[PDB]
Amino acid sequence: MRYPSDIVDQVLKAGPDKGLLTWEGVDAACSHCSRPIQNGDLYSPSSVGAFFSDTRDLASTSRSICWRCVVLRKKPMLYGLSAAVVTQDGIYSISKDVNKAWLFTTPPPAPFLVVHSSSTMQHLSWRTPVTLDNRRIHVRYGPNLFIVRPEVVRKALSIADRVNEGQKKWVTPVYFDRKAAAMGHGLITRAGAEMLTQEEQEFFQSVTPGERWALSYLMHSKRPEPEVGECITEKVMTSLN
RNA sequence: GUGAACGGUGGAGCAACACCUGAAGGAAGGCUUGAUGAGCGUGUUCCCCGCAUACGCGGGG
Ligand SMILES: [Zn+2]
């Protein structure tokens, strides 16, 4: 519940691969997940391929992967956590917009860990911190480390439901990009320029990029009700074995 | 040791093909280069204006 690699044996039960070396000597942190490798725990020397391009998100330059993050670099872990929230009892999916509606509005009370892929297969699990508090959520989205406050998401959603109550067409006040890629991601629309007051506009610039990315999955004409995502920890474990 | 440090928006692509500014329409009706200025009458002291300042000068008809 402290390091992102803890879910290897806390969220989902797993063990070392038994071809891993035993650490002898002084303390050194794992290159992935920033977990200190003590004396006696199993570790692997660093054998990343040339296709690994996340050297900028490595926690340390010790060139040693802890066994939990050896499990975390496995391909079934890589496509199993392409969109997943890992609570203290299981791994659930956030692929649907109703699942992100559940995650960023009334979050689960566990100290979870949120990963989401901005591409096909990405190293997501180890390079994000564990969110200890529901109010402050660390979301990994591709090369982006995002922080989402569900209270600010609730305030923006209440603002949007106020300015779009009674109207026939649900027009968004501020445009949000799902990929977080367009220039106008966070830019105020003309309808939102005419239908929001000044302090609401400064609020919509003042939100964090993670809240913008979350609102991108929950600001559209059909509004997703918070529905808990389907539990996928059985699918990941079966794939892992 | 600025959640830092590192990171090319890139490569290629014909605005081009054909198209009559053209048809019709009177610069005319009337008007002396001919004159005009070229030569033809008065016969002796009479008014008025200035410079002067009256010794005289210029001058109107
Ligand atoms: Zn690790």
Side-chain angles (χ1 to χ4, degrees):
Chain A
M1 74 226 60
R2 165 67 184 77
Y3 301 98
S5 41
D6 286 334
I7 71 109
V8 168
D9 53 17
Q10 302 199 11
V11 38
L12 79 76
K13 340 314 294 184
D17 293 22
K18 305 184 191 312
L20 315 162
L21 281 66
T22 305
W23 186 263
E24 328 281 353
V26 87
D27 231 355
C30 180
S31 57
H32 315 218
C33 82
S34 155
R35 162 191 294 281
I37 288 154
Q38 313 290 31
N39 271 296
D41 36 37
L42 299 316
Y43 89 102
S44 161
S46 262
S47 61
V48 295
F51 306 147
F52 179 78
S53 49
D54 296 320
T55 319
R56 61 186 55 93
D57 274 343
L58 291 176
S60 70
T61 59
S62 75
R63 315 181 88 260
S64 46
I65 308 130
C66 77
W67 66 266
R68 308 194 182 70
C69 264
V70 166
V71 176
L72 270 194
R73 297 168 46 53
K74 270 157 176 22
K75 211 159 154 213
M77 290 299 344
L78 280 197
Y79 45 78
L81 314 181
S82 100
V85 48
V86 190
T87 65
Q88 214 64 40
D89 63 75
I91 308 171
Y92 321 154
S93 64
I94 48 167
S95 42
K96 301 192 235 323
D97 305 79
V98 309
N99 311 343
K100 298 211 179 45
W102 162 78
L103 179 60
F104 306 125
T105 325
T106 71
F112 46 79
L113 174 87
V114 179
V115 283
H116 191 281
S117 192
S118 84
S119 200
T120 158
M121 164 168 329
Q122 296 190 301
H123 277 290
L124 305 163
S125 41
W126 47 270
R127 49 178 177 171
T128 164
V130 177
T131 95
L132 299 195
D133 188 340
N134 264 353
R135 303 139 52 197
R136 178 166 151 120
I137 297 155
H138 271 284
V139 177
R140 170 62 61 168
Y141 182 61
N144 313 117
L145 189 53
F146 275 157
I147 302 150
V148 184
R149 294 163 284 179
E151 166 74 83
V152 180
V153 172
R154 285 190 280 274
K155 175 167 159 164
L157 283 178
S158 301
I159 285 163
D161 282 53
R162 165 169 38 81
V163 300
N164 289 352
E165 80 217 318
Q167 329 326 335
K168 181 179 61 61
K169 197 158 127 63
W170 202 104
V171 47
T172 177
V174 51
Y175 169 60
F176 288 131
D177 181 340
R178 285 182 182 255
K179 309 294 163 243
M183 182 184 198
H185 180 36
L187 229 42
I188 184 73
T189 73
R190 314 301 314 293
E194 85 104 26
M195 98 204 175
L196 291 176
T197 184
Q198 193 61 47
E199 49 99 358
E200 277 148 9
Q201 294 184 50
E202 309 195 3
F203 165 74
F204 272 123
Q205 324 168 318
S206 88
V207 290
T208 74
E211 295 156 355
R212 301 186 206 121
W213 170 88
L215 281 158
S216 76
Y217 293 67
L218 40 77
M219 277 267 251
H220 35 294
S221 73
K222 94 161 180 303
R223 277 233 56 231
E225 298 313 308
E227 192 211 309
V228 189
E230 44 104 15
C231 187
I232 69 153
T233 188
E234 292 87 21
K235 178 187 185 65
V236 189
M237 304 186 71
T238 303
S239 185
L240 207 52
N241 298 322

CSV table of all heavy atoms in Angstrom, one decimal, chain A residues 5 30-35 65-70 72 126, ligand 1:
chain,number,residue,atom,x,y,z
A,5,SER,N,4.7,-1.4,-6.4
A,5,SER,CA,5.0,-2.8,-6.7
A,5,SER,C,4.3,-3.7,-5.6
A,5,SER,O,4.3,-4.9,-5.8
A,5,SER,CB,6.5,-3.0,-6.6
A,5,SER,OG,7.1,-2.2,-5.6
A,30,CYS,N,15.3,0.2,-6.1
A,30,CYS,CA,15.0,-0.3,-7.4
A,30,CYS,C,14.8,0.8,-8.4
A,30,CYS,O,14.4,1.9,-8.1
A,30,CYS,CB,13.6,-1.1,-7.3
A,30,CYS,SG,13.1,-1.9,-8.8
A,31,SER,N,15.3,0.5,-9.7
A,31,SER,CA,15.2,1.4,-10.7
A,31,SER,C,13.8,1.8,-11.1
A,31,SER,O,13.5,2.9,-11.4
A,31,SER,CB,16.0,0.9,-12.0
A,31,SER,OG,15.4,-0.3,-12.4
A,32,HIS,N,12.9,0.8,-11.0
A,32,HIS,CA,11.4,0.9,-11.2
A,32,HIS,C,10.7,0.8,-9.9
A,32,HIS,O,11.1,-0.1,-9.1
A,32,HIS,CB,11.0,-0.3,-12.1
A,32,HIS,CG,11.8,-0.5,-13.3
A,32,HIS,ND1,11.3,-0.9,-14.6
A,32,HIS,CD2,13.2,-0.5,-13.5
A,32,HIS,CE1,12.3,-1.1,-15.4
A,32,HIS,NE2,13.5,-0.9,-14.8
A,33,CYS,N,9.7,1.6,-9.7
A,33,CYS,CA,8.8,1.7,-8.5
A,33,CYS,C,9.5,2.4,-7.3
A,33,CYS,O,8.8,2.5,-6.3
A,33,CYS,CB,8.1,0.4,-8.1
A,33,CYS,SG,9.1,-0.7,-7.1
A,34,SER,N,10.7,2.8,-7.4
A,34,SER,CA,11.4,3.5,-6.3
A,34,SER,C,11.3,2.7,-4.9
A,34,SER,O,11.0,3.4,-3.9
A,34,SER,CB,10.9,4.9,-6.1
A,34,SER,OG,11.1,5.4,-4.8
A,35,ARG,N,11.5,1.4,-5.0
A,35,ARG,CA,11.4,0.6,-3.7
A,35,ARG,C,12.9,0.2,-3.3
A,35,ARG,O,13.6,-0.3,-4.2
A,35,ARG,CB,10.6,-0.7,-3.9
A,35,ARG,CG,10.8,-1.7,-2.9
A,35,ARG,CD,10.1,-3.1,-3.3
A,35,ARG,NE,8.7,-3.0,-3.3
A,35,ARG,CZ,7.9,-3.0,-2.3
A,35,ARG,NH1,8.4,-3.1,-1.1
A,35,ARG,NH2,6.6,-2.9,-2.4
A,65,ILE,N,16.3,-4.5,-10.7
A,65,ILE,CA,14.8,-4.5,-10.6
A,65,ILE,C,14.4,-5.5,-9.5
A,65,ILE,O,14.9,-6.6,-9.4
A,65,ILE,CB,14.1,-5.0,-11.9
A,65,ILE,CG1,14.6,-4.1,-13.1
A,65,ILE,CG2,12.6,-4.8,-11.8
A,65,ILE,CD1,15.1,-4.9,-14.3
A,66,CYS,N,13.6,-5.0,-8.5
A,66,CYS,CA,13.1,-5.8,-7.5
A,66,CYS,C,12.1,-6.8,-8.1
A,66,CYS,O,11.5,-6.6,-9.1
A,66,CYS,CB,12.4,-5.0,-6.4
A,66,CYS,SG,10.8,-4.4,-6.8
A,67,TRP,N,11.9,-7.9,-7.4
A,67,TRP,CA,11.1,-9.1,-7.9
A,67,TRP,C,9.7,-8.7,-8.1
A,67,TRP,O,9.0,-9.2,-9.0
A,67,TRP,CB,11.3,-10.3,-7.0
A,67,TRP,CG,10.6,-10.1,-5.6
A,67,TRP,CD1,11.2,-9.7,-4.5
A,67,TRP,CD2,9.3,-10.4,-5.2
A,67,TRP,NE1,10.4,-9.7,-3.4
A,67,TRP,CE2,9.1,-10.1,-3.9
A,67,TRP,CE3,8.2,-10.9,-5.9
A,67,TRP,CZ2,7.9,-10.3,-3.2
A,67,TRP,CZ3,7.0,-11.1,-5.3
A,67,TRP,CH2,6.9,-10.8,-3.9
A,68,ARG,N,9.1,-7.9,-7.3
A,68,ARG,CA,7.8,-7.4,-7.5
A,68,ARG,C,7.7,-6.6,-8.8
A,68,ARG,O,6.8,-6.7,-9.6
A,68,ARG,CB,7.3,-6.5,-6.3
A,68,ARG,CG,7.5,-7.2,-4.9
A,68,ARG,CD,6.7,-6.4,-3.9
A,68,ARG,NE,6.9,-6.9,-2.5
A,68,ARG,CZ,8.0,-6.9,-1.8
A,68,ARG,NH1,9.1,-6.3,-2.2
A,68,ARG,NH2,8.0,-7.5,-0.6
A,69,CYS,N,8.7,-5.7,-9.0
A,69,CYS,CA,8.7,-5.0,-10.3
A,69,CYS,C,9.2,-5.8,-11.4
A,69,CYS,O,9.1,-5.4,-12.6
A,69,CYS,CB,9.5,-3.7,-10.2
A,69,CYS,SG,8.4,-2.3,-9.8
A,70,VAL,N,9.9,-7.0,-11.2
A,70,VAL,CA,10.1,-8.0,-12.2
A,70,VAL,C,8.8,-8.5,-12.7
A,70,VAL,O,8.5,-8.7,-13.9
A,70,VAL,CB,11.0,-9.1,-11.7
A,70,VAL,CG1,11.0,-10.3,-12.6
A,70,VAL,CG2,12.4,-8.6,-11.6
A,72,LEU,N,5.9,-6.9,-12.4
A,72,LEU,CA,5.2,-5.7,-12.9
A,72,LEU,C,5.6,-5.5,-14.4
A,72,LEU,O,4.8,-4.9,-15.1
A,72,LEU,CB,5.4,-4.5,-12.1
A,72,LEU,CG,4.5,-4.2,-10.9
A,72,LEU,CD1,4.6,-2.8,-10.4
A,72,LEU,CD2,3.0,-4.5,-11.4
A,126,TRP,N,4.6,0.8,-12.4
A,126,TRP,CA,5.7,1.1,-11.5
A,126,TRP,C,6.0,2.6,-11.4
A,126,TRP,O,6.4,3.0,-10.3
A,126,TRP,CB,6.9,0.3,-11.9
A,126,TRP,CG,7.3,0.4,-13.4
A,126,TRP,CD1,6.9,-0.4,-14.3
A,126,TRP,CD2,8.1,1.4,-14.0
A,126,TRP,NE1,7.4,0.0,-15.6
A,126,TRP,CE2,8.2,1.1,-15.4
A,126,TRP,CE3,8.8,2.5,-13.5
A,126,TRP,CZ2,8.9,1.8,-16.3
A,126,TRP,CZ3,9.6,3.3,-14.4
A,126,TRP,CH2,9.6,2.9,-15.8
C,1,ZN,ZN,10.3,-2.0,-7.8
